[PDB]
């Protein structure tokens with residue numbers, strides 16, 4: 669049984685991707701962009717009112733297995749889109765003018781593993797040569813300053829970069845999709861947890877992006893919009909500058925492909941519950957995050973390129 673106010677297992681999320689598409693055929697279409705290491709279909713939802721030459725926003729959740737609130741947020745975004753389209757001015761305009769490529773769970777194998785064996789699992793579930801240690805960090809596997817300082821060369825480590833850039837089927841599937849739809853994608857959004865932080869490029873090196881001033885102002889305003897609902901405090905800035913060196917990230921790779929609006933959203937909380945954020949907080953966390961996501965969407969729509 670699926671619920672937007674509860675954490676749902678992969679079988680429930682997969683069934684939901686099929687049901688939400690069939691219940692809303694004029695707003696949602698579903699495709700499989702590839703398969704995981706264990707052979708699970710990587711589903712992608714195209715959310716928006718169909719039309720010609722439409723710009724798009726790409727959003728992924730569940731790159732990291734244990735970050736259950738991120739998987740919950742992608743489902744909440746789709747929930748909001750189908751519930752408020754035709755009922756709220758902004759969401760109506762967004763779905764008419766833009767398409768949202770929502771990837772509810774990127775690291776499906778890791779997500780199944782958090783439900784079955786280890787709640788605190790982070791990486792993929794792929795095998796590594798010369799060791800029994802499992803998985804690669806997908807957010808250290810993209811081809812953007814790949815496997816430099818901030819990523820580990822050790823397969824037993826949580827930040828393992830992989831055997832090569834895009835060695836993971838999941839990373840290659842996401843990268844292939846963006847490369848194939850690059851002319852349409854205007855924004856990249858990666859949903860994670862926890863720290864209450866909005867990251868923008870660069871994370872693979874200590875360097876500021878070309879549009880640093882613009883991204884600083886946009887993140888500042890998105891953080892401000894998020895706080896209006898419950899007073900939740902978010903920090904923001906370039907990845908390497910305000911968080912840590914994290915090379916081979918999807919956001920930096922997307923930015924270097926020409927997607928100048930690229931953000932990583934680290935959701936609730938600040939360490940009290942960490943990855944084990946209670947189900948009672950899903951509603952509040954998702955509703956406030958919606959305000960930041962809608963602010964960025966509105967900005968992108970007013971600054972098309």
Ligand SMILES: CC1(C)[C@@H]2CC[C@@]1(C)[C@@H](NC(=O)[C@@H](CC1CCCCC1)NC(=O)N[C@@H](CCCCN)C(=O)O)C2
Nearest residue numbers: 732807826827861862863867871907914917918919932
């Ligand atoms: C020691 C670690 C394994 C190492 C640093 C903290 C960890 C716990 C882990 N990081 C994590 O598990 C989480 C949450 C941590 C909670 C405690 C404070 C620090 C964050 N952050 C994360 O994956 N960020 C993304 C940010 C991406 C931005 C650019 N793409 C990433 O690293 O991929 C990574």
Ligand SMILES: [Zn+2]
Nearest residue numbers: 732735860861
């Ligand atoms: Zn993460």
Ligand SMILES: [Zn+2]
Nearest residue numbers: 748954955958
């Ligand atoms: Zn709502």
Ligand SMILES: [Zn+2]
Nearest residue numbers: 882967970971
């Ligand atoms: Zn402007």
